[PDB]
């Protein structure tokens, strides 16, 4: 009765803190907004985080709820 | 202890009918929860299902509607009939003998009881080897070709017979053990009385009251498994062994009776049987017939018997008494368990039952009779005690002839009153 | 009444502590007040027979380290999970 599974989705952080990114590169693929978007980072319809400008990836924790934010710092 | 549909059939034409109330009692003792009790009437059993095709469809519909787990017939049905009922309704089917074996399996706590019950189950299962469904299929071959050399059905029959012989061999070992325990008493001139009878006869509580020794007793069918022996006092012969016994039921399985050969050795070799009967049971004659039938089956009907009608307190306005045969020997006794009525008369009847002496001697000596005190009080007792003139002491005594002879040999026997 | 005699630990860590317990000493710590914590080693059999007494965990103890008497209370004890031994003692100055 238990011989079933789904194709793995290859979700996760595709681009880590400090690495250089061209505009449009996916940073993290995620179910739900586990990482939120900050400066120069756009949220996709399936909650993908991508770079809206060429720069360097930066991770931070902000706000009252201590939520994790992805920002791109222009190099 | 699961959900069951119960099945009973009124085979009034022949003596192969069974009591629905007793059947329900056995089921409840097993602990099964009954969701429905189906009744039918037939002339002789249907070979295919043990019931009609219509009634089999009704039991299948009842199982489907009630979500029952098992089906308990009140009758012995063949492996093919069990298979066909299983095919109609996916639920499992339990024969009356299967129910009885399951009850004994739950109740068995001793090594001997477990051995006997597993032997009975092994024989009952060896009867039901009809389906050889296995994944190895038929082994093809020819002359001079490899193979098992025999069929799987024959191999399984071999294995079942071998393990049955193994259980049997350990059972004769248990018989040797119990026979040593018996032989401890037989070398002594032991009187041994076994109280036996139909279940719920109050015989276990009669044992408890007589012996002042706690043994389990309740309103549960087949409460007691394996016997218990206890010393009891009787006026004539002194020390006697009262033995409790596992009860009977109408139509005990023959495999079960054969399995209990080791346990029934007490009743086989009892110097007396106390056939304890529930007077308040409306099927008292049927209980007599069933108990005599099993006694004949184990070939123990030639032993002296004495009937004991218990539960007279349920009979309105009755007092205990003893009914006696034409030879002036007590053949029947009446009594009650809780109220204790009839117990001293049972003791008196037991005194009368076994004995071979009625003469009473009278003894007297000069001052050399402290040894006489010791010896008399040693063998049995002093029956009638007093003194007389000049310091002489005149005893009156009645003890068995073997005690007389051994006392005469031990003593100088200058009293010229005791032989 | 209880006067324990202890040394100051030259080395601290898993390996050093297990070497101490194989050599039949064991580590302990003195903290509390405002002086810096002091990491010491004690003699196992002596302190075990000492703490067998019930008043050990209630009276003011004294510990002799480098010729200095420090007055303490037993705060926590760590015991071997299934042997009658001691792993660590915490002492609070008082």
């Amino acid at each position: 009765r238990n011989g079933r599974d789904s194709e793995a989705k290859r979700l996760g952080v595709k681009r880590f803190g400090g690495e250089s990114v061209l505009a449009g590169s996916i940073i993290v693929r995620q179910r739900g907004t586990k990482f939120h978007a900050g400066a120069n980072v756009g949220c996709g319809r399936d909650h993908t985080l991508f770079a809206k400008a060429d720069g360097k990836v930066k991770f931070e924790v902000k706000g009252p709820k201590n939520r994790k934010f992805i920002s791109i710092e222009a190099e | 202890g699961e959900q069951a549909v119960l099945v009973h059939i009124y085979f009034a034409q022949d003596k192969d009918m069974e009591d629905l109330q007793e059947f329900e009692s056995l089921v409840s003792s097993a602990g099964v929860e009954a969701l429905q009790v189906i009744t039918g009437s037939r002339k002789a059993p249907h070979p295919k299902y043990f019931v009609g095709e219509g009634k089999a469809v009704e039991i299948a519909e009842a199982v489907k509607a009630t979500g029952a787990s098992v089906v308990l017939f009140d009758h012995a049905l063949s492996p093919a009939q069990e298979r066909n009922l299983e095919r109609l309704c996916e639920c499992r089917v339990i024969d009356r003998t299967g129910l009885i074996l399951d009850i004994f399996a739950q109740r068995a706590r001793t090594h001997e009881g477990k051995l006997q019950v597993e032997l009975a189950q092994l024989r009952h299962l060896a009867t039901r080897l009809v389906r050889g469904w296995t994944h190895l299929e038929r082994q093809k071959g020819g002359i001079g070709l490899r193979g098992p050399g025999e069929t799987q059905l024959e191999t399984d029959r071999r294995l079942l017979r071998n393990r049955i012989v193994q259980i049997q061999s350990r059972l004769e070992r248990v018989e040797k053990q119990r026979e040593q325990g018996r032989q401890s008493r037989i070398k002594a001139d032991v009187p041994t009385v076994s109280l036996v009878g139909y279940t719920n006869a109050g015989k276990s509580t009669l044992f408890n009251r007589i012996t002042e020794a706690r043994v389990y007793a309740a309103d549960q069918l087949f409460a007691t498994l394996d016997p218990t022996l206890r010393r009891i006092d009787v006026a004539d012969v002194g020390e006697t062994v009262l033995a409790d016994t596992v009860g009977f039921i109408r139509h005990l399985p023959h495999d079960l009776v054969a399995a209990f050969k080791a346990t029934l050795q007490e009743t086989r070799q009892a110097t007396l049987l106390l056939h304890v009967i529930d007077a308040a049971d409306v099927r008292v004659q049927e209980n007599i017939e069933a108990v005599n039938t099993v006694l004949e089956e184990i070939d123990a009907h030639e032993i002296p018997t004495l009937l004991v009608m218990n539960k007279i307190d349920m009979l309105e306005d009755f007092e205990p008494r003893i009914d006696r045969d034409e030879e002036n020997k007590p053949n029947r006794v009446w009594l009650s368990a809780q109220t204790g009525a009839g117990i001293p008369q049972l003791f008196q009847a037991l005194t009368e039952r076994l004995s071979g002496e009625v003469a009473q001697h009278t003894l007297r000596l000069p001052p050399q009779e402290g040894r006489l005190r010791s010896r008399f009080y040693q063998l049995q007792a002093i029956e009638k005690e007093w003194m007389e003139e000049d310091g002489s002491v005149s005893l009156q005594v009645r003890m068995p002839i073997v005690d007389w002879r051994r006392l005469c040999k031990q003593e100088p026997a200058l009293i010229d009153y005791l032989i | 009444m209880f006067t324990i005699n202890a040394e100051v630990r030259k080395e601290q860590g898993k390996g050093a502590s297990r070497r101490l317990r194989a050599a039949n000493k064991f580590p302990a710590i003195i903290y509390g007040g405002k002086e810096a914590p002091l990491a010491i080693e004690l003699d196992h059999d002596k302190v075990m027979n000492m703490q067998a007494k019930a008043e050990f965990y209630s009276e003011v103890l004294t510990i002799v380290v480098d010729g200095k008497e420090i007055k303490v209370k037993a705060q926590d004890v760590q015991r071997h999970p299934y042997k009658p031994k001691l792993q660590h003692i915490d002492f609070v100055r008082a």
Partner: protein, 136 residues
């Protein structure tokens, strides 16, 4: 025979029984039986030891059972091959690590406690030791 009344799931993985026991001190009563060894303790074994010690102390004092078997152990029947799905649940065990206090006891003299715990430890499959309450 102890068993969970209900569970989220019916079959657990085998896992491993590594590490040292938590709950290694006599907390409720005055005396306790502590596990020096490592292994499983089945509900049947726990019941046997409890019955033995409760008979040793003829309805007197109070007894605590600290270990509860909450792990289902499956076994495949005989004449069955490997695979074809995981086996069916047959009994429940409590994983025991060294130091785990199994039983606890109060309201009895120490001699009677020692005798009862010897009779109990004669039923368990792991080496045990007698322990007494300590302060701090």
């Amino acid at each position: 025979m102890l068993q969970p009344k209900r569970t989220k799931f019916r079959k657990m993985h085998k896992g491993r029984n590594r590490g040292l026991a938590q709950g290694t001190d006599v907390s409720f009563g005055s005396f306790g039986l502590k596990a020096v060894g490592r292994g499983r303790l089945t509900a049947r074994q726990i019941e046997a030891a409890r019955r033995a010690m409760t008979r040793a102390v003829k309805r007197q004092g109070k007894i605590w059972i600290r270990v509860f078997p909450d792990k289902p152990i499956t076994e495949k029947p005989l004449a069955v091959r490997m695979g074809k799905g995981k086996g069916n649940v047959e009994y429940w065990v409590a994983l025991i690590q060294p130091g785990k206090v199994l039983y606890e006891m109060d309201g009895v003299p120490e001699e009677l406690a020692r005798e009862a715990f010897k009779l109990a430890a004669a039923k368990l499959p792991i080496k045990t030791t007698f322990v007494t309450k300590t302060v701090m």
